[PDB]
Structures are given as C-alpha cells and as structure tokens.
Amino acid sequence: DLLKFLKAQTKTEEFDAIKIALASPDMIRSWSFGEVKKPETINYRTFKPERDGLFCARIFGPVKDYECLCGKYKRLKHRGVICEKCGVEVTQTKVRR
Amino acid sequence: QLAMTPQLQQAIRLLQLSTLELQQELQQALESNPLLEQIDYQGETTQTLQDYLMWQVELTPFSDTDRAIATSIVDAVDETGYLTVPLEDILESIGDEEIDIDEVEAVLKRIQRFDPVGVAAKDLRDCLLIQLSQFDKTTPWLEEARLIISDHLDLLANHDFRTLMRVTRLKEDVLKEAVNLIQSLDPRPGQSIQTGEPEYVIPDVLVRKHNGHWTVELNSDSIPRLQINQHYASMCNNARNDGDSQFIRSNLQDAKWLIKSLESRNDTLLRVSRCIVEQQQAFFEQGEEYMKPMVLADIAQAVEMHESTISRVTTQKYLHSPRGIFELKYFFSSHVNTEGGGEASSTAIRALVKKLIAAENPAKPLSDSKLTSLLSEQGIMVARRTVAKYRESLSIPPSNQRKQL
Amino acid sequence: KSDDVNGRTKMYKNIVDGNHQMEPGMPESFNVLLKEIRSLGINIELED
Amino acid sequence: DLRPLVPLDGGRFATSDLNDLYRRVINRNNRLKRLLDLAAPDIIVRNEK
Amino acid sequence: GQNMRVAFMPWNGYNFEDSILVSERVVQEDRFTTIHIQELACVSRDTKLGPEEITADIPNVGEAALSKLDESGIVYIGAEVTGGDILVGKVTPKGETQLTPEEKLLRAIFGEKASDVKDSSLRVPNGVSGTVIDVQVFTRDGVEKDKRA
DNA sequence: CAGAAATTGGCACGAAAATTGCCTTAAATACAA
DNA sequence: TTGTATTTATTGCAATTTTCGTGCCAATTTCTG
Numbered sequence: 116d117l118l119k120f121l122k123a124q125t126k127t128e129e130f131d132a133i134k135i136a137l138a139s140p141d142m143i144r145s146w147s148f149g150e151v152k153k154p155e156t157i158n159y160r161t162f163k164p165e166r167d168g169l170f171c172a173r174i175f176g177p178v179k180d181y182e183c184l185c186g187k188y189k190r191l192k193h194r195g196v197i198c199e200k201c202g203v204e205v206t207q208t209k210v211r212r
Numbered sequence: 213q214l215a216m217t218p219q220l221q222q223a224i225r226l227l228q229l230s231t232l233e234l235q236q237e238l239q240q241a242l243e244s245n246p247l248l249e250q251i252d253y254q255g256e257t258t259q260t261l262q263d264y265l266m267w268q269v270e271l272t273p274f275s276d277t278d279r280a281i282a283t284s285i286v287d288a289v290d291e292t293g294y295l296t297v298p299l300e301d302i303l304e305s306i307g308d309e310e311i312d313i314d315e316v317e318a319v320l321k322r323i324q325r326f327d328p329v330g331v332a333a334k335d336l337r338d339c340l341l342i343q344l345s346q347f348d349k350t351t352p353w354l355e356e357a358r359l360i361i362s363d364h365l366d367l368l369a370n371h372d373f374r375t376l377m378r379v380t381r382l383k384e385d386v387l388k389e390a391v392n393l394i395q396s397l398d399p400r401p402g403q404s405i406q407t408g409e410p411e412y413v414i415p416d417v418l419v420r421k422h423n424g425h426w427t428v429e430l431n432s433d434s435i436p437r438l439q440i441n442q443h444y445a446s447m448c449n450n451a452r453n454d455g456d457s458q459f460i461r462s463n464l465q466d467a468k469w470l471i472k473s474l475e476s477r478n479d480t481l482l483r484v485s486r487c488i489v490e491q492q493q494a495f496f497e498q499g500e501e502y503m504k505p506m507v508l509a510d511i512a513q514a515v516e517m518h519e520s521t522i523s524r525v526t527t528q529k530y531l532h533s534p535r536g537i538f539e540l541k542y543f544f545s546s547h548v549n550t551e552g553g554g555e556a557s558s559t560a561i562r563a564l565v566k567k568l569i570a571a572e573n574p575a576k577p578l579s580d581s582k583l584t585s586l587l588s589e590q591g592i593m594v595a596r597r598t599v600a601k602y603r604e605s606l607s608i609p610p611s612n613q614r615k616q617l
Numbered sequence: 618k619s620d621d622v623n624g625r626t627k628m629y630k631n632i633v634d635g636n637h638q639m640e641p642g643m644p645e646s647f648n649v650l651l652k653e654i655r656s657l658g659i660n661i662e663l664e665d
Numbered sequence: 666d667l668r669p670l671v672p673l674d675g676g677r678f679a680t681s682d683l684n685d686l687y688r689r690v691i692n693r694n695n696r697l698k699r700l701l702d703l704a705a706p707d708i709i710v711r712n713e714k
Numbered sequence: 715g716q717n718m719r720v721a722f723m724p725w726n727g728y729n730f731e732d733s734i735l736v737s738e739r740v741v742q743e744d745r746f747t748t749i750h751i752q753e754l755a756c757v758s759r760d761t762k763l764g765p766e767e768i769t770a771d772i773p774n775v776g777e778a779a780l781s782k783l784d785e786s787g788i789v790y791i792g793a794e795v796t797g798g799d800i801l802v803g804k805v806t807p808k809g810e811t812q813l814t815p816e817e818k819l820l821r822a823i824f825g826e827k828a829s830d831v832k833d834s835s836l837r838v839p840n841g842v843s844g845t846v847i848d849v850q851v852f853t854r855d856g857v858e859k860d861k862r863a
Numbered sequence: 864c865a866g867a868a869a870t871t872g873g874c875a876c877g878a879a880a881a882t883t884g885c886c887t888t889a890a891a892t893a894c895a896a
Numbered sequence: 897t898t899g900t901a902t903t904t905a906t907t908g909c910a911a912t913t914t915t916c917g918t919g920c921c922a923a924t925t926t927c928t929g
C-alpha cells in the first residue's frame with residue numbers, strides 16, 4: 116500500500132533522553148551499509164558515482180528518487196527492490212544523508 | 213616475427229587508454245610497489261520541475277487517496293513534462309484493489325492543468341489539446357486548429373499538406389494561419405523550469421598559433437607522471453640480506469620499467485599529434501570543408517611507426533584547437549573522387565551538403581539528385597546514394613518532409 | 618521557520634488553508650550533529 | 666550528502682577538506698594491505714603503519 | 715556636496731534624534747540625484763557536445779521577449795530593461811539523444827531547430843533596472859566575430 | 864483520373880581500411896674454468 | 897684463452913573483422929496529360 120508507505124516516512128521519533136558512550140567495532144559495523152575500498156569520488160567520464168568509492172551508490176543510496184543506477188528499475192512501483200545488476204536499492208535520494 | 217614477452221605487451225597496452233583510465237590504472241601499480249610515488253562550502257537547493265509540481269500538489273484540496281495517486285503521477289514525469297508510464301502502471305504502483313482507472317484519470321486531468329499547463333501529458337496530441345482548451349472561446353482559428361490536432365496529426369507530421377486540404381476541406385489561407393497557431397504552442401511544457409549544467413572534457417593536446425605557425429604541446433595539467441621513492445631506494449645497499457634487499461631490487465627494477473613505458477607513451481602521443489596537426493593546417497585556419505582525406509597509413513609514414521601503433525594511440529584522446537575540442541580520430545575520414553584526379557573528404561562533403569540544404573528554397577526543397585548535380589559542378593563526383601547516406605548521417609529529413617508554406 | 622524540513626511545508630499549507638497551527642518536529646541540523654559526532658567513534662543516540 | 670563536492674563554473678568538482686582527509690587514509694590503508702600481503706621487509710611496513 | 719539653506723529649530727518631531735527634514739524643492743531640483751552603473755557578463759564556453767552559441771532565435775521564447783535583441787542576439791544600446799528581460803541570447807547544445815517515434819513526431823511538426831538546444835540566455839536579475847549604455851564583446855582569437863563585434 | 868516520372872532507402876557487392884592476438888626471445892656483457 | 901649465466905632491447909606482423917562507396921529495385925510521392 117502506497118498510502119501507508121508515504122505516511123510512514125514523515126513520522127517523528129519520540130524520546131526523552133540522549134545517551135553517549137564508546138563505540139565498539141561491532142557497533143561501527145552495525146551502523147554501516149558497506150565498506151569503502153577505493154579513494155575515487157566521481158567518474159568524470161559519466162559523472163556518476165564510482166563503485167566502492169567515497170560517493171558510492173550501493174553503500175550510501177541512490178542519486179535519483181526511486182531510480183536504480185544502471186536503469187533497470189526506475190519507477191515508484193519497484194520501491195524497495197534491490198537491483199541484481201549493481202546492488203542499488205530504489206528509494207529516496209535523501210537517504211544519502 | 214617479434215618475440216612477445218608479457219612485459220612488452222603491457223607497455224603496448226598502455227597506449228590505447230584514455231587519461232582517466234590511465235590514471236586509474238597507475239594507482240593500482242602505485243599501491244602495489246613501495247618504491248613508486250606521485251610527484252604531487254555547503255551548497256544551495258534548486259527547484260526542479262517535480263519540486264514545483266509537488267508544491268502545487270500539497271496545496272490542492274485532494275484527499276488521502278488522491279494525493280497518493282498524484283504522488284505516483286508526478287513521480288513518473290521526465291524533464292520534458294511528458295508522462296513516461298501508462299496509467300496501468302500507476303494504478304499498479306498504488307497497490308490498492310478498490311481504486312479504478314477512472315479515479316486515476318480524474319486526478320491526471322487535474323494535474324495536467326498545473327503550472328506549466330500541458331504538463332504530465334501522455335503524448336503530443338494530448339499536450340496540444342490541453343493547451344488549446346485553456347484558450348478563450350472567442351479566438352480565431354481555434355476550432356480549425358483543434359480539428360486537425362484531434363484528427364489528422366500524421367498528415368502534418370509528414371508535411372502532407374495536400375491531403376489535409378482534402379480531408380479537412382480547407383483553403384490556403386486557413387491552412388497556414390491555423391498551422392502557425394499550432395506552432396505558437398509549446399511542444400515541451402516542462403522545460404520552463406529547467407535546471408542543470410553541461411559536461412566538459414579536459415583535453416590532452418593543445419594546439420595554438422604562434423608567429424604564423426601552429427604549435428602543439430601536451431596539456432601539462434592532465435599529463436601523468438611518476439617518480440621513484442628515494443627513501444626506500446636508499447635502503448638498497450644491504451640493510452639486511454635475502455628478502456630485505458631482494459624485494460627492493462626487484463621492485464626498483466619494475467618501477468624504472470613503468471616510468472620508461474609511461475614516457476614512451478607520452479612522446480609517441482606528442483609526435484602523432486604534431487604530425488596530425490601539420491598534415492591538416494588547412495582545417496584549423498578556415499574551419500571545416502577544407503579537411504584532407506588522410507588515413508592511418510599516411511600518418512604511419514612520416515613518424516615511421518606501424519599502422520597498429522597509430523591505431524592504438526589515437527583512441528579516446530582529445531585535442532583542443534581554437535575552433536573546439538575534437539576526438540583526434542575525427543581527422544581520419546574517407547574520400548571520393550574529384551575532377552582533376554584529386555580526392556575530396558567525406559567530412560567536407562557533409563559540410564557542403566549541410567550548407568546547401570540550409571540555404572534551399574523552403575517552398576521547394578532540394579532532393580538528392582538536385583544535390584548530386586549541384587555538387588557535380590565543382591568537380592566532386594558523388595553518387596546519389598552516397599549523398600543520401602551523408603544526409604541520413606546528418607539526421608536531415610528527405611526532401612518531401614522539408615517543404616512548408 | 619528555519620530547519621524542520623517536514624514542518625515548513627505543513628506550516629505553509631496550514632497558513633494557506635487559514636489554520637494557524639504547527640506540528641513542530643525536529644530540526645535537521647541536530648541529525649547532522651549526531652552523524653558527525655558518531656563518525657568520530659562515539660556512540661551517541663536518542664533513547665526511549 | 667553531509668560532505669558534498671563543490672560545483673563551480675567550468676565543470677570542476679573541487680575536492681573538499683573531508684574528502685581529501687578520507688582519500689589520504691584510504692590510500693595509506695590500501696598500501697599497507699598490499700605490503701602486508703607481499704611480506705615486505707619490516708622497515709617499510711613500520712613506516713607505512 | 716551642495717549648499718543648502720538650513721535652519722536650526724525643532725519641527726514637530728521630524729528632526730528628533732539626528733533625523734533630517736528635507737523640503738520638496740530639493741527633490742524637484744534634482745540636487746542629490748546620482749547615477750549608478752552596473753555591469754553583467756555572459757560567457758559562452760565550449761562543451762563536449764559542441765560549443766555554446768550566442769543567437770537571436772531562442773527556441774521556446776516568444777517574439778515579444780526577442781523584441782529588443784538585434785540580429786546577433788545582443789540587446790540594443792539605449793533599451794530600458796527591467797525585471798527578467800533578456801540581455802544576451804545564448805543557447806547551449808543538448809545532444810546524443812536516440813530518436814524515438816514520439817521524438818520524431820515532435821521534431822517534424824516544430825522543426826529541428828527547436829530540438830537539441832537548451833536556453834542559457836543572460837537575463838536581468840530580479841529587482842534590477844536601468845538603461846543599456848555600453849556593450850563590450852571579447853572574442854578569442856580563431857573564433858569568427860559576429861556583426862556586433 | 865491516372866499512368867508516368869521522381870524520390871527514397873533496404874540489401875548486396877568487392878575492396879579497402881581498421882582492429883586484435885600474439886615467438887611466450889637474440890645479442891651484448893661480465894664472470895668463471 | 898673460451899663457455900656460459902646474466903642483462904638488455906623489442907612500441908611490430910599477419911590474420912580477422914569491420915566499414916567504405918555505389919548499384920538494384922521495390923515502395924511511396926509527386927506531376928503533367
């Protein structure tokens with residue numbers, strides 16, 4: 116259902132405290148969505164993110180809303196689908212934040 | 213033949229690589245060899261078309277389901293303002309069983325009258341009809357243009373003006389004013405809110421003019437260069453035996469080899485570019501249509517190399533002339549015969565054909581025969597089929613599809 | 618008026634609708650602070 | 666998106682401070698990984714560390 | 715400055731705490747009227763899909779917005795511009811798009827000139843007005859000068 | 864009205880041009896017997 | 897004295913694929929009697 120999907124991304128988390136502590140390596144690996152292996156940012160030939168780079172698109176998310184990187188899955192009817200050709204999920208481009 | 217060892221084949225393979233790929237490949241060899249080294253704001257949110265459409269969707273008294281449908285409809289709108297998916301894909305993206313296509317059409321007809329008008333239109337006919345409906349009823353030629361937009365648009369597409377007069381029962385006076393009114397419409401309504409920047413290419417070779425003669429040199433910004441790490445080279449002389457010295461020796465050897473192979477690529481590129489720009493000084497002085505028909509065997513006769521080397525070097529490397537940026541393979545072209553025993557390049561015949569077509573009588577366009585005969589008075593000797601091939605390479609419609617009133 | 622991304626649009630829509638009421642939400646520059654603090658190897662989090 | 670590249674006129678994506686500091690670390694880490702795989706002499710690996 | 719016939723006295727609080735009360739003849743005689751001159755620039759660069767060109771026929775705009783542009787696409791000297799008027803008509807090329815039947819239908823009816831070109835023309839900023847008094851054209855050596863230059 | 868002249872492009876020719884995978888060692892040199 | 901392990905020097909050939917211009921001819925437009 117699209118109505119619930121759209122309604123469930125504007126909600127505000129409720130809390131009453133802020134806790135600070137030390138970060139375990141397992142905690143850091145739990146935060147991450149992938150490992151950065153190469154120091155290149157932008158291709159400069161297609162002006163697209165380079166794989167396993169600082170500005171990568173499989174680790175950090177799509178560059179366009181509900182649009183995969185290679186271009187197989189491109190619309191909102193495919194939301195949540197992880198492409199099998201490049202591993203990019205199709206969601207909002209704000210998840211890069 | 214030549215005894216090909218897999219260390220010479222890597223030096224040969226280094227030629228057919230662009231500067232970006234060459235710098236990408238140099239990093240891998242840099243991080244696998246200790247003795248190698250290299251010598252060396254927040255932003256602003258712009259408003260696109262979809263953001264503008266959403267700003268109006270949120271301010272329109274929709275319902276909870278209508279707004280969800282409008283989100284899908286606005287999402288499937290490209291930068292030209294045309295709906296890129298059928299409504300059956302939007303009804304599927306909603307993911308609800310009770311919603312029918314009638315509601316989707318009702319929401320689409322409301323989204324289609326946003327700013328700009330005609331946005332999110334299925335095709336050109338719908339996009340023109342939407343704009344034609346917003347005009348005041350007391351408008352000249354409104355019904356006459358609407359009739360041919362709604363019924364006979366293929367005839368106007370093929371410039372079949374004769375058939376339009378018969379089917380629409382119209383004279384010359386109205387069939388020109390109505391068509392002018394149609395051309396007054398906006399074909400792409402979504403390009404009003406257009407945001408973006410073009411993409412640039414940093415050249416490899418720079419050619420300029422100095423003291424009346426052309427000078428050529430490699431672009432010093434993008435040229436790749438490596439260096440030997442002296443601190444590790446100072447450890448060669450028996451810091452410790454066996455590995456401690458053998459490793460440094462066997463890596464210094466390969467670093468020297470790689471640096472030599474990079475210099476042997478830069479020099480070859482520079483010499484090939486200098487020969488190329490020396491053989492076609494006519495092109496840079498007075499633009500196109502004066503370019504000579506040269507091939508690989510012509511270049512691999514003054515620099516004294518093999519044709520396969522010239523083939524590899526000129527791959528994906530750009531040259532910056534005062535005219536513009538070129539591929540450095542754009543200068544190798546075919547040829548056709550000429551009066552006087554000479555030859556004329558295809559890249560000049562294309563410019564001549566473009567110039568002749570861009571100056572014909574609009575009422576009576578020139579056909580391929582009328583271009584072949586016109587060219588065969590300067591002694592160009594081109595067959596009609598070759599002229600047709602050149603025109604279709606230039607993406608120019610045939611003569612019967614260029615006439616107009 | 619400054620930072621809550623999802624509250625700006627709601628406030629604008631309510632003002633245009635003749636209803637002067639806001640849903641406060643959370644500023645977007647404290648999430649940046651959390652992401653920059655926890656990229657130093659320090660586990661800071663909101664709880665409950 | 667919290668460390669974006671700066672687009673200035675001319676097609677130039679100048680690398681910011683944080684991206685430079687990340688690229689330096691990634692280069693050193695990759696070099697150290699390769700050297701540890703190659704079984705390099707301890708002097709070079711100590712300098713790399 | 716200017717010589718003003720001044721008087722020292724309180725006048726109903728309109729010169730309270732360093733304020734100044736000015737007559738209407740000072741405004742009628744244009745004694746403190748000044749002239750301010752502001753410059754704007756339009757640069758045509760070289761892209762990979764061909765170069766940008768300065769032209770007087772922008773595809774999407776109407777015939778009114780091009781009323782004060784000459785044959786070379788540059789505003790007339792002496793024209794009173796305001797708001798978002800077009801000063802220099804500049805077009806950047808978009809290309810390398812594969813043809814489709816809808817794209818062919820769009821290109822046939824409205825002509826090939828409208829397609830494959832964008833609009834990057836220079837326009838007056840918002841809230842800026844004045845009169846065009848000087849136009850300067852700098853052309854790189856090798857490029858062919860237009861009629862204005 | 865309608866047959867004929869004109870136009871257009873898919874498909875087919877030989878020849879030329881451009882690519883791509885390899886001979887995956889021979890000769891000069893310093894050292895040892 | 898010579899035989900040999902060591903170290904340079906070597907950025908081309910020759911098949912194989914692709915592209916070239918131009919003729920044949922069927923399908924679609926235009927034109928004059």
Ligand SMILES: [Zn+2]
Pocket residue numbers: 183184185186187188198199200201202203
């Ligand atoms: Zn993909």
